[PDB]
Amino acid sequence: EKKEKQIEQQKKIQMSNLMNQARLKVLRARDDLITDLLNEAKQRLSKVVKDTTRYQ
Amino acid sequence: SQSQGIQQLLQAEKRAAEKVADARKRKARRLKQAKEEAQMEVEQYRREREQEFQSKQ
DSSP, rough: OOOHHHHHHHHHHHHHHHHHHHHHHHHHHHHHHHHHHHHHHHHHHHHHHSSSSHHH | OOOHHHHHHHHHHHHHHHHHHHHHHHHHHHHHHHHHHHHHHHHHHHHHHHHHHHHHO
């Protein structure tokens, strides 16, 4: 019984940790997408600065 | 003449005592056989639940 309960507890631990990593993985993917948005914004500003009159 | 009565009585006592002693030896031997068989059946259950534990894993 102790060994079986050890298995049944460890396969709660492992699966809970895996779902936790799934959550944080999707959140990190979203963060990467928003950082990609901001980097593109920096690209656009660097382009605008080329247009002197607008930059003026 | 007289001594044969005492002789037979003592020898019958010896025979009965040896018989009951052998019976007590039988008690002990059968008790230890029960102990051993209990261990073997415990071992059978242990093997079966070992298989079940492996299947669980």
